[PDB]
Design a binder for this molecule. Structure first.
Ligand SMILES: [Cl-]
Ligand SMILES: [Cl-]
Ligand SMILES: [Cl-]
Ligand SMILES: [Cl-]
Ligand SMILES: [Cl-]
Ligand SMILES: [Cl-]
Ligand SMILES: [Cl-]
Ligand SMILES: [Cl-]
Ligand SMILES: [Cl-]
Ligand SMILES: [Cl-]
Ligand SMILES: [Cl-]
Ligand SMILES: [Cl-]
Ligand SMILES: [Cl-]
Ligand SMILES: [Cl-]
Ligand SMILES: [Cl-]
Ligand SMILES: [Cl-]
Ligand SMILES: [K+]
Ligand SMILES: [K+]
Lengths: 230, 244, 238, 248, 196, 238, 233, 243
């Protein structure tokens, strides 16, 4: 028999800093790198899926996930925590669809998912999520890219990177990214930002990439990733 | 062998070397208790327990460490007796629930499996402490044969031919290995069970003792009951005289 | 739900959490009430408003019912909870029973509320003391005061907050029938005892008066400054 | 269990609440946020803390929230806690509307959220919301109004105030400049840019770094607008042109 | 079965209610008041089920009062009427509903004189004039006939007189006395009770 | 010590200190003696006064017509356990119309007393009981402790200086089975006497007796009703 | 740091022992059980001549035949007193009779150690009551006086004192008590002992005096009547 | 600054300054406290489970000492770590599998069972009141659509599919062994996979064991029924290694 703790595990330090959120930020800043780029006619999301052994089945688990027909996800941080947020995101997307009969605006999903993240910075007996989310979407004929993080704060991006070498990946994008890309160009500059932080040789098995357009959201097949890897 | 201050207060906290000390300290409580024994024979299972006389003011038969959990199932306990009784009550309810749901006597292995789940549940949380005892479960039928199981504070359960728990679990096991129990009748096993308790007993540290004995085999028609005053005293005499 | 005992006894037999709440009231703004013959008057101070701030909002005189009003000292955010709980209770006593609340009853409720917060799981005590002013239906004037512990007593005159020890001692020296004779001099008695401790200036003084049968009156910074003139004309001279 | 309890809703020996005052520190490190009350309106002006060449600018605002037909607020502190409170502010506003069929008076809406924030300091053993809020609005009782909200759950009505970074410097700057009863919205807009420029960190000021929202009463309707980039540009440059006329 | 009536003019509201407290076949009271003071300028006239009327009316009365204490100003006649409408409508699809028919008269400093009619179903309607009870069937036509939106108080009391005389002549029930009060700029004024 | 603030914390030695600390509360209470013959079960307890002006504490309590108890330790924990025992005996008579066998009632205490020793935030029962009853199996003397453990005994003593009484009974335990009731009570009194210091002996004010058996229901003799037993006394020797 | 239901190595609950200590800071109260009635007396402890005299109530009425003297944390006591008053009227409703002084005291004693943190209600007690109580009255067993403290333990007393000066007043009663004392001597003794152990002089407005005797009900003494018993110093 | 700590981050599942969960990391060390090593390998036509069966004495009923468990007709698992912790996870897995079929009407896929156990394991990682399970579940079975499957879940909540995998004390040495056997492409038959698994455990521990000393559970395309091999059948594959 059990009954949980009712007190917050995230409190204010004398400096005015919620240390557990910043400590959760450290968990994502140390995870595998991930990049998202808004590209005028679509969005691209790519991640390092280096399992660091040939024994793994590269096809079994995925890091780039669909939330609905028009929304996708990537993360940097803890895999298990991310899974919780994916499941919650998918349910929120359906809850919205059932009520309004209209694909959830990406902005509205992110707000709803970010609120779930906020809960774990104030609720009792729990630690915050050690994941930052990168959420892409297409609604009203416009591409969207959003970032959610352990704080429960959310941001809108033209392009960004997170995880290992997120600082170097960001400056690279500042110089490299220009507005009004075509989507197929964005996959290149996404894989290029990923190459900056890699360490090893890139095969279609080592990285995972998803795309979002007017036709919806899908993850690229291993054969498609190979064709961009040249 | 132990960890101070932090990692040994709660059962919801792992120690740096991957250990739950709260379970291990509860396992220490049983190691301090007097020895309980039980060995599987050809046609049943016998139990033997040394019961240390704290005061001569207590009744002969007080602090029974041999229980009837179900008509065909007997329990032998060692450790914090207060916990041992609650687990005896939990085990009773489980055997009762099984008949209510399925219509026949609980298979012993399953009874052990079920009670073990309940024990284990008290090893995961800060809200509760682990059970400070270890117990054996014995039964007999013509279908399943003679069966003997033992559960400890972690929630682990295994089958046995011979088993012992408490102070001198080691002194008992080496004496049990000597027996060809796979061929022995349960009338014979009682005599040997009685002498092993006497050998195991420390008559120079502990003051004195009583011997508790249980049945569960063909001679009892499959029902678990106490060994008669007559048969016990023959086995007690056997124990005292082959002690030389 | 949060089930931790917040307020517990110390080895010396002290309720530290309740005592800390009394430190909060001692840090509070000066509040003084005095019972007259025909009227009762409250006065509240240590206002120190930035004069960039609209002061209609930060008023420490509150009316609980038609015939009951109160002043507080300490954590002003805590006070608002107590005040509105007392306002709800004022309307419930009117629903369960025909009669309006007696001053002693509302004081007893506020006191029972504060007491409950010293012995209940999960919560800290309130950080306010109250001065409750009202009239009986028979017309006899009543003044009461409460504190974080949950105790309440009736007073002829009293002060709570910072400079309470100083103003209280003044009232003991200055509370006779010569001062209570008129309605004006009792109001003056408040202002004098008030201006005795505050960083001087009638501009920092908000005080309320209520007559036996009249609705509560909050005074014009005109009316009070007129009385601050009758003190300075009779200070250099007297 | 009690070994892990931080005891958030507890009294300190001095008679003060630690978590509340520690939350106050969080506000100081957040963006500078000012509100000024005028005769024919009221405005919010706040420092944008989300600035980057790579940010997308999807929403109308970063720190300004519309809560009501006749009310808007601005925020300083942890933005997630801010989102929780502003959504709740929008709810309380609608509940009042549903019940009485007229908009919630300004002070009342503020009071309601303050009661929730105060409850978080007394019971429940939770951390308080690390947010200070500036409310601006119009009701039929007190006209144009400005309010300040503390994480303590304490509130006050102001003619001019500021919260966040270099807050104390910004208010004493306003204390000298603010002309009581004589302030027009044009005067208050100019003062906002003046106070911000001295108070802000990066020094020159920019239309990407500041956010300004005006609340006016036009044609029997309360009009709320978040100022366009072309408008902020002219507001900064009119102060810049006056900074060049200050020498001889 | 009781009677309520309201007449709204250009700058005033005239209200009247019968003074009978009836049980089965007997008149228990000759001088019962069916008006409730909510504010200085809001009256709530209630009618219907015996135990339900006073309990409901006072609950609303005490909450309008609570609002005044909590805010230092009173509810507008509209806000009041809409509050009482919400409270009745929420009890409609419940295990215990209130069978009360009510009339809210009030004066707003901005909007002016107001008269609100409410069902036991909790449908709210603003009217220049209205009446509750079976008497309405006999009086609403008289009101329809002689009402102009610019009616003076002298003429309005005379119009109420014409309506109450009809209740004596044609209505089967015995209602000999009525409470008469006027709401305006200065508040609620008790007027000479009309007896027959 | 840090292994001794909660019942859910095991000591490295394999022990629970909070159970043992509760066991100390029993030893601090005044002595009480239980013994039985083949026909009767007798409780003899020593009443204690904090001052000479205050009366003596109740030591022996009613449970049912066939069951009685003597307490040692905390008063409230004793009263709580007494009410549980009474409720169990009531439910037994309500349902089965026959008195609850002593063995089973004690087993229920053993099960109930165990619960709080295993849950965090809870505590052990600060009382030990001596239970005298009569049923189909004849007279019974039972012993309960803060630890949920319980014992079936021929005779027992618990409380302050109960070791002296324990040794007396241990010598004369073979005597009790053929004892007449009057001889049985004197044995109980003689053991209780051993607990007292040499200066003082059993008085009519400080001795309480409870008796249940084949002849009669459980009865408590206190003051005037007690002197028949005390009179006829072999003198205190050494 | 520990929990509220923690045993000392000695064998006591810390919070209880600390609650006993809180009473040692409370004003002294005396009760005397006379064969012809019970008298209760207490010092008010006026902090200022501005405080209203009859405002402090450390002796209250529970029932027609029962009086209760209180010491320690006054705020804790009045929660317990309302509970005592509720019990008498619940019992009156159910049984159409007045409760015994023992049962009333026993009822209040049931709330004793009903405090805790975990495995408890939302409104369950966090701590004990820093109060001692003297229940004095007349039932069908003559006049009686009972004493109760936060341990829950309650016992009858022929005469008892509790408060700051407890031991001093206890010794003064010890050498001045006959179980045959008259009620005239009973009120006198309490008034004589009260002035000895106090920091302030005995005034007519300084103390509360109460009597419960077989014939007449519980009586709160009026200032004029107090001046007749303070006439015989 | 690797391996820094502050607060109660070593005791409860909250973050360290680095952003780690030490209590989760300690739970992996609890897997080795079992003192046993588990190996699983996948072929084209099968999946094979293998683990050391240590029996301290002949007093133990040898038939009751096992870390091989059946969750479903089609799905089996090998458990590594604390015995009682492992049994709880098995019971919960059976519950989840039977629960799945009641809601959805088809046999639970090996990958889906693993994810479900992982999501539950995640909860012990985020909530402070309970410790993670110091055990390791390697699942096998045949997906009607995607061929043979081998899946592993964590006390961390991590889950993945594998060509081959080890767990426990000699994990790290046996994963390196398996990598060398993977690089070279054999014909992954039933015999090849069984022996690859057996020879892996016989080299890292260096025993050359009796049939009684190990346990083998298999799953095959022709016979998707999860079967534990018993003494006589293991003995055949052991004398087949010595040819
Ligand atoms: Cl808690
Ligand atoms: Cl994962
Ligand atoms: Cl929705
Ligand atoms: Cl996809
Ligand atoms: Cl209400
Ligand atoms: Cl409450
Ligand atoms: Cl004060
Ligand atoms: Cl933030
Ligand atoms: Cl709570
Ligand atoms: Cl209201
Ligand atoms: Cl309907
Ligand atoms: Cl122990
Ligand atoms: Cl006690
Ligand atoms: Cl003892
Ligand atoms: Cl105690
Ligand atoms: Cl005391
Ligand atoms: K209906
Ligand atoms: K405890």
């Amino acid at each position: 028999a059990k009954r949980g703790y009712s007190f917050s595990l995230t409190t204010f330090s004398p400096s005015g800093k919620l240390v557990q959120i910043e400590y959760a930020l450290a968990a994502v800043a140390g995870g595998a790198p991930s990049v998202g780029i808004k590209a005028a006619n679509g969005v691209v999301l790519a991640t390092e899926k280096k399992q660091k052994s040939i024994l793994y089945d590269e096809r079994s688990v995925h890091k780039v996930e669909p939330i609905t027909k028009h929304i996708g996800l990537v993360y940097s941080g803890m895999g298990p925590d991310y899974r919780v947020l994916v499941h919650r995101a998918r349910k929120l997307a359906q809850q919205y669809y059932l009520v309004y009969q209209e694909p959830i605006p990406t902005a509205q999903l992110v707000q709803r998912v970010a609120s779930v993240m906020q809960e774990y910075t104030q609720s009792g007996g729990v630690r915050p999520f050690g994941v930052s989310l990168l959420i892409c979407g297409w609604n009203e004929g416009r591409p969207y890219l959003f970032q959610s993080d352990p704080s429960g704060a959310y941001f809108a991006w033209k392009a960004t990177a997170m995880g290992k070498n997120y600082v170097n990946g960001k400056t690279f994008l500042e110089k490299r990214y220009n507005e009004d890309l075509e989507l197929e160009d964005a996959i290149h500059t996404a894989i290029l930002t990923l190459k900056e932080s890699f360490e090893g040789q890139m095969t279609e098995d080592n990285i995972e990439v998803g795309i979002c357009n007017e036709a919806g959201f899908r993850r690229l097949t291993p054969t498609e990733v190979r064709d961009y890897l040249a | 062998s132990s960890i101070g201050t932090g990692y040994d207060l709660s059962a919801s906290t792992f120690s740096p070397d991957g250990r739950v000390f709260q379970v291990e300290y509860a396992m220490k409580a049983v190691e301090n208790s007097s020895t309980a024994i039980g060995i599987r024979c050809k046609d049943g299972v016998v139990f033997g327990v040394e019961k240390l006389v704290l005061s001569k003011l207590y009744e002969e038969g007080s602090n029974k460490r041999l229980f009837n959990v179900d008509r065909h199932v007997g329990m032998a306990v060692a450790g914090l007796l207060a916990d041992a009784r609650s687990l005896a009550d939990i085990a009773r309810e489980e055997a009762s629930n099984f008949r209510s749901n399925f219509g026949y006597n609980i298979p012993l292995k399953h009874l052990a499996d079920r009670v073990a789940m309940y024990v284990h549940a008290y090893t995961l949380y800060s809200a509760v402490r682990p059970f400070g005892c270890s117990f054996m479960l014995g039964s007999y039928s013509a279908n399943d044969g003679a069966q003997l199981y033992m559960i400890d504070p972690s929630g682990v359960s295994y089958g046995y031919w011979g088993c012992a728990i408490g102070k001198a679990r080691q002194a008992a096991k080496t004496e049990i290995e000597k027996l060809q129990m796979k061929e022995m009748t349960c009338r014979d096993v009682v005599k040997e069970v009685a002498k092993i308790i006497y050998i195991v007993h420390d008559e120079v540290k502990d003051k004195a003792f009583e011997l508790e004995l249980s049945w569960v085999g063909e001679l009892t028609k499959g029902r678990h009951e106490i060994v008669p005053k007559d048969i016990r005293e023959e086995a007690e005499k056997y124990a005292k005289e082959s002690l030389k | 739900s949060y089930d931790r005992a917040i307020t517990v006894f110390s080895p010396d037999g002290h309720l530290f959490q309740v005592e800390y709440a009394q430190e909060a009231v001692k840090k509070g703004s000066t509040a003084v009430g005095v019972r007259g013959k025909d009227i009762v008057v409250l006065g509240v101070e240590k206002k120190s408003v930035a004069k960039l701030q609209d002061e209609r909002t930060v008023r420490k005189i509150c009316a609980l019912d038609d015939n009951v009003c109160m002043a507080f000292a300490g954590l002003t955010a805590d006070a608002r909870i107590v005040i509105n709980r007392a306002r709800v209770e004022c309307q419930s006593h009117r629903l369960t029973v025909e009669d309006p609340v007696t001053v002693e009853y509302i004081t007893r409720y506020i006191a029972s509320l504060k007491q409950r917060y010293t012995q209940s799981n999960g919560r800290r005590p309130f950080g306010i003391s109250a001065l409750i002013v009202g009239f009986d239906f028979d017309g006899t004037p009543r003044l009461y005061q409460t504190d974080p512990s949950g105790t309440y007593h009736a007073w002829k005159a009293n002060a709570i907050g910072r400079g309470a020890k100083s103003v209280r001692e003044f009232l003991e020296k200055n509370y006779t029938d010569d001062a209570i004779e008129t309605d004006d001099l009792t109001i003056k008695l408040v202002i004098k005892a008030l201006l005795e401790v505050v960083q001087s200036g009638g501009k920092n003084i908000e005080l309320a008066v209520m007559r036996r049968d009249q609705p509560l009156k909050i005074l014009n910074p005109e009316e009070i400054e007129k009385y601050v003139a009758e003190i300075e004309k009779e200070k250099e001279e007297n | 269990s009690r070994r892990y309890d931080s005891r958030t809703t507890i009294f300190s020996p001095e008679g003060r609440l630690y978590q509340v005052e520690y939350a106050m520190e969080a506000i100081g490190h957040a963006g500078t946020c000012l509100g000024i009350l005028a005769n024919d309106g009221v405005l919010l002006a706040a420092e944008r803390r989300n600035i980057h060449k790579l940010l997308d600018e999807v929403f109308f605002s970063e720190k300004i929230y519309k809560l009501n037909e006749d009310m808007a607020c601005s925020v300083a502190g942890i933005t997630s806690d801010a989102n929780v409170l502003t959504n709740e502010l929008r709810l309380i506003a609608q509940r009042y509307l549903l019940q009485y069929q007229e908009p919630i008076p300004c002070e009342q809406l503020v009071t309601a959220l303050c009661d929730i924030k105060q409850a978080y300091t007394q019971f429940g053993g939770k951390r308080p919301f690390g947010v200070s809020l500036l409310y601006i609005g119009w009701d039929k009782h007190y006209g144009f109004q400005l309010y300040q909200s503390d994480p303590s759950g304490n509130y006050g009505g102001w003619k001019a105030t500021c919260i966040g970074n270099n807050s104390a410097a910004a208010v004493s700057m306003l204390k000298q400049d603010y002309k009581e009863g004589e302030m027009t919205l044009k005067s208050a807009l100019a003062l906002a840019v003046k106070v911000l420029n001295k108070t802000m960190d990066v020094s020159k000021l920019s239309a990407e770094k500041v956010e300004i929202a005006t609340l006016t009463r036009e044609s029997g309707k309360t009009v709320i607008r978040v100022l366009k980039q072309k408008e902020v540009e002219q507001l900064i440059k009119k102060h810049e042109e006056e900074e060049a006329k200050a020498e001889r | 079965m009781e009677y309520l009536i309201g007449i709204q003019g250009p700058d005033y509201v005239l209200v009247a209610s019968d003074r009978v407290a009836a049980s089965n076949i007997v008149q228990m009271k000759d001088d019962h008041d069916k008006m409730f003071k909510m504010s200085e300028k809001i009256l709530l006239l209630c009618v219907g089920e015996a135990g339900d009327t006073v309990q409901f009316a006072e609950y609303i009365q005490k909450n309008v009062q609570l609002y005044k204490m909590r805010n230092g100003y009173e509810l507008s006649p509209t806000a009041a009427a809409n509050f009482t409408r919400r409270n009745l409508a929420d009890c409609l699809r419940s295990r215990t509903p209130y069978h009360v028919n009510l009339l809210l008269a009030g004066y707003d400093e901005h909007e002016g004189p107001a008269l609100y009619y409410m069902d036991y179903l909790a449908a709210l309607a603003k009217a220049p004039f209205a009446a509750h009870g079976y008497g309405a069937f006999l009086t609403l036509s008289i009101l329809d006939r002689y009402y102009t939106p610019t009616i003076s108080r002298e003429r309005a009391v005379e119009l109420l007189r014409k309506c109450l005389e009809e209740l004596q002549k044609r209505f089967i029930l015995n209602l000999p006395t009525f409470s008469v009060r006027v709401i305006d700029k200065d508040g609620i004024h008790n007027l000479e009770n009309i007896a027959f | 010590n840090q292994y001794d603030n909660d019942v859910t914390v095991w000591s490295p030695q394999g022990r629970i200190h909070q159970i043992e600390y509760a066991m100390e509360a029993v030893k601090q209470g005044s002595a009480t003696v239980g013994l039985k013959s083949k026909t009767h079960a007798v409780l003899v307890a020593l009443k204690r006064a904090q001052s000479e002006l205050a009366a003596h504490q109740k030591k022996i309590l009613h449970v049912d017509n066939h069951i009685g108890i003597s307490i040692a330790g905390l008063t409230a924990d004793a009263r709580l356990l007494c009410n549980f025992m009474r409720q169990e005996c009531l439910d037994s008579r309500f349902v089965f119309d026959r008195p609850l066998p002593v063995s089973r009632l004690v087993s229920l205490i053993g099960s109930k007393t165990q619960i709080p020793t295993q849950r965090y935030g809870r505590r052990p029962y600060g009382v030990g009981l001596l239970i005298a009853g009569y049923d189909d199996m004849g007279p019974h003397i039972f012993q309960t402790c803060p630890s949920a453990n319980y014992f079936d005994c021929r005779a027992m003593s618990i409380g302050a200086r109960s070791q002296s009484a324990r040794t007396y009974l241990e010598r004369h335990m073979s005597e009790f089975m053929e004892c007449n009731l009057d001889e049985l009570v004197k044995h109980g009194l003689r053991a209780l006497r051993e607990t007292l210091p040499a200066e003082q002996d059993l008085t009519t004010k400080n001795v309480s007796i409870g008796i249940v058996g084949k002849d009669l229901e459980f009865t408590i003799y206190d003051d005037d009703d007690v002197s028949p037993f005390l009179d006829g006394l072999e003198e205190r020797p050494q | 740091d520990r929990g509220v239901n923690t045993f000392s190595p000695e064998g006591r609950l810390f919070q209880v022992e600390y609650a006993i200590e809180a009473i040692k800071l409370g004003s002294t109260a005396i009760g005397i059980q006379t064969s012809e009635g019970v008298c209760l007396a207490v010092e008010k402890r006026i902090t200022s001549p501005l405080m209203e005299p009859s405002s402090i109530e450390k002796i209250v009425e529970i029932d027609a035949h029962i009086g209760c003297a209180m010491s320690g944390l006054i705020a804790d006591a009045k929660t317990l007193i309302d509970k005592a008053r509720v019990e008498t009227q619940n019992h009156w409703f159910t049984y159409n009779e007045t409760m015994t002084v023992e049962s009333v005291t026993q009822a209040v004693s049931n709330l004793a150690l009903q405090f805790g943190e975990e495995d408890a209600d939302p409104g369950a007690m966090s701590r004990p009551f820093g109060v001692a109580l003297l229940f004095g009255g007349v039932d069908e067993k003559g006049p009686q006086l009972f004493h109760m403290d936060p341990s829950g333990t309650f016992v009858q007393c022929d005469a008892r004192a509790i408060g700051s000066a407890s031991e001093g007043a206890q010794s003064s009663l010890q050498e001045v008590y006959h179980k045959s004392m008259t009620l005239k001597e009973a009120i006198k003794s309490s008034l004589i002992i009260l002035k000895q152990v106090m920091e302030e002089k005995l005034n007519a407005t300084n103390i509360e005096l109460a009597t419960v005797q077989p014939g007449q009900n519980f009586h709160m003494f009026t200032k004029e009547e107090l001046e007749e018993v303070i006439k015989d110093i | 600054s690797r391996g820094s700590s502050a607060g109660f981050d070593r005791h409860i599942t909250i973050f360290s300054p680095e952003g780690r969960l030490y209590q989760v990391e300690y739970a992996f060390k609890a897997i080795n406290q079992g003192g046993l090593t588990s190996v699983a390998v996948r072929g084209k036509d099968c999946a094979v489970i293998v683990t050391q069966k240590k029996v301290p004495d002949k007093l133990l009923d040898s038939s009751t000492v096992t870390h091989l468990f059946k969750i479903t007709e089609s799905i089996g698992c090998v458990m590594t770590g604390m015995t009682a912790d492992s049994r709880s996870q098995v019971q919960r897995a059976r519950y989840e599998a039977a629960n799945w079929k009641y809601k959805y009407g088809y046999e639970i896929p090996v990958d889906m069972l693993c994810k479900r156990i992982a999501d539950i394991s995640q909860v012990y990682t985020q909530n402070a009141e309970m410790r993670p399970l110091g055990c390791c579940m390697i699942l096998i079975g045949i997906d009607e659509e995607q061929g043979p499957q081998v899946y592993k879940c964590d006390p961390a909540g991590y889950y993945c599919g594998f060509k081959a995998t080890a767990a426990g004390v000699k994990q790290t040495e046996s994963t390196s062994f398996l990598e060398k056997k993977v690089k070279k492409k054999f014909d992954w038959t039933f015999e090849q996979t069984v022996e690859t698994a057996i020879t892996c455990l016989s080299t890292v521990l260096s025993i050359d064991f009796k049939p009684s000393e190990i346990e083998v559970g298999v799953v095959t395309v022709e016979n998707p029924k999860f079967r534990i091999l018993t003494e006589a059948e293991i003995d055949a594959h052991l004398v087949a290694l010595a040819e």
